[PDB]
Amino acid sequence: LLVLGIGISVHKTDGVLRFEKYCQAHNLQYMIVGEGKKWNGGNLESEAGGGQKINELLIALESIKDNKLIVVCDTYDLIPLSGPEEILRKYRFLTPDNKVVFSSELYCWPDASLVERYPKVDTKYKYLNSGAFMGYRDDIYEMIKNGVKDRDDDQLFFSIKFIETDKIVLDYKCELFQAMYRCNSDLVVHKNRIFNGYTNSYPVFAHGNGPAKKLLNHMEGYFMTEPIDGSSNTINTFKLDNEPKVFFALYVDSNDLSALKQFLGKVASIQYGNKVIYLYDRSDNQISYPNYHTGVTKYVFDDFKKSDAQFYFLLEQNCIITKKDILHELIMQVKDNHRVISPMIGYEQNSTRTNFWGDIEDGYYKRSENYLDLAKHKVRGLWNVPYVYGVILMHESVVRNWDLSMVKYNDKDMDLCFSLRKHTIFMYMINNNNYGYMV
Ligand SMILES: O=c1ccn([C@@H]2O[C@H](COP(=O)(O)OP(=O)(O)O)[C@@H](O)[C@H]2O)c(=O)[nH]1
Numbered sequence: 133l134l135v136l137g138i139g140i141s142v143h144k145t146d147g148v149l150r151f152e153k154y155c156q157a158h159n160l161q162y163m164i165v166g167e168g169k170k171w172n173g174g175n176l177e178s179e180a181g182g183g184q185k186i187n188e189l190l191i192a193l194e195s196i197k198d199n200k201l202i203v204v205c206d207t208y209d210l211i212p213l214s215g216p217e218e219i220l221r222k223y224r225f226l227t228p229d230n231k232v233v234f235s236s237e238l239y240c241w242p243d244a245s246l247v248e249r250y251p252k253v254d255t256k257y258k259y260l261n262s263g264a265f266m267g268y269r270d271d272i273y274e275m276i277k278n279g280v281k282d283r284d285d286d287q288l289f290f291s292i293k294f295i296e297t298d299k300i301v302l303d304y305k306c307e308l309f310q311a312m313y314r315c316n317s318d319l320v321v322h323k324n325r326i327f328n329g330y331t332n333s334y335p336v337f338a339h340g341n342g343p344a345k346k347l348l349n350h351m352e353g354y355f356m357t358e359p360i361d362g363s364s365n366t367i368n369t370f371k372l373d374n375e376p377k378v379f380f381a382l383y384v385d386s387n388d389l390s391a392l393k394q395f396l397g398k399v400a401s402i403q404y405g406n407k408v409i410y411l412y413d414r415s416d417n418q419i420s421y422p423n424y425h426t427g428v429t430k431y432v433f434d435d436f437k438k439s440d441a442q443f444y445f446l447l448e449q450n451c452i453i454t455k456k457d458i459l460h461e462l463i464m465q466v467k468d469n470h471r472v473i474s475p476m477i478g479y480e481q482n483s484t485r486t487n488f489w490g491d492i493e494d495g496y497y498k499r500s501e502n503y504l505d506l507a508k509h510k511v512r513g514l515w516n517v518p519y520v521y522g523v524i525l526m527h528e529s530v531v532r533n534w535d536l537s538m539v540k541y542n543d544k545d546m547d548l549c550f551s552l553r554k555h556t557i558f559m560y561m562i563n564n565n566n567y568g569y570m571v
């Protein structure tokens with residue numbers, strides 16, 4: 133068995149890094165198709181496309197000469213939750229005649245007229261989703277061998293193949309694949325898996341297709357790729373052996389002189405040797421802070437890019453850090469798909485108002501099911517969330533390679549988070565300790 137995940141990008145997203153980590157945890161051999169190449173498959177958000185996925189898959193298949201079983205899948209919004217033995221057993225059971233199995237889903241798209249051409253079935257999971265499929269290398273090769281246009285629609289291509297041929301079967305019972313979109317009430321997390329209570333199955337591949345990225349990101353916080361080490365926090369005093377260089381980017385407003393002094397005093401007490409400090413002041417109105425810049429109304433990345441710093445540590449004036457070893461603690465969490473980390477702090481006079489959002493609806497705050505549990509530390513860890521504010525540690529691989537300056541909301545903190553979401557760079561809130569408060 134080989135898993136061919138489509139990851140066409142010059143630099144890796146957190147989606148692909150997460151997919152790789154889940155593949156490794158489940159002993160799945162995999163190739164990232166299209167790694168290092170520029171995406172030309174279209175703006176999938178506002179328009180369909182994805183033909184380039186087919187063309188890159190075809191090139192990859194030229195390296196795989198034997199007729200082996202292959203899974204072909206999305207990577208940005210998809211993870212495996214089990215290993216090759218379960219996959220092979222399910223495949224054999226689903227298709228004794230070794231057909232290509234595609235994911236099912238709730239909706240018939242992009243061509244509504246196909247509704248009446250699909251086989252009639254006694255399930256809501258009626259239609260093809262082209263985001264995950266499995267079959268023999270030669271069968272898949274035969275379907276795609278003439279290539280397509282980069283901007284052709286791969287969803288439509290495979291829908292037509294299903295309807296018109298006998299080469300494809302759909303995974304109606306969600307055994308191998310789960311298209312999660314609008315199936316929230318079917319699904320629970322149990323024993324490190326998704327359980328679909330509608331189908332009575334444990335789907336191997338969890339696909340947060342469309343807006344269900346939010347749901348998969350949510351469930352991620354409850355899954356494991358390795359056991360918790362319960363002793364990681366037993367001493368809450370963290371010290372790095374060798375300190376990477378951290379660029380402190382302080383967003384200040386000297387108009388509020390007393391708030392500024394108090395903030396700078398706390399920042400000066402963060403224990404870290406290898407650093408450079410820049411002050412970015414909103415006011416137009418300094419001996420202790422040579423790198424001082426005035427009239428700044430946006431987040432600034434160019435000074436960091438020109439530096440040799442390994443991390444960018446964004447701190448806003450209204451966030452008061454009290455945990456002196458916090459930078460050591462945060463850096464220890466930066467690995468794999470965990471590259472943007474924000475410690476959870478609450479407002480001093482009502483700690484349920486924090487510096488993250490658990491959910492988002494049309495770009496605005498929505499209360500997630502576990503929001504209050506995180507804010508009150510009923511459960512702790514790292515959580516993939518749509519917005520973080522005020523204290524953000526970002527690895528250089530993010531800041532040096534991605535446009536963090538995209539504009540939607542005309543608000544610096546909201547637009548930074550929009551930028552990251554758009555690039556499939558994840559924001560992780562961490563609430564393992566008491567870090568501070570907001571004013
Ligand atoms: O720059 C890009 C954009 C997308 N994709 C791949 O195309 C898939 C389809 O996009 P998406 O999952 O967002 O589509 P959806 O499942 O929401 O229709 C992604 O998961 C990736 O595997 C890629 O490789 N590079």
Ligand SMILES: [Mn+2]
Pocket residue numbers: 206208209210263339340341342
């Ligand atoms: Mn997808």
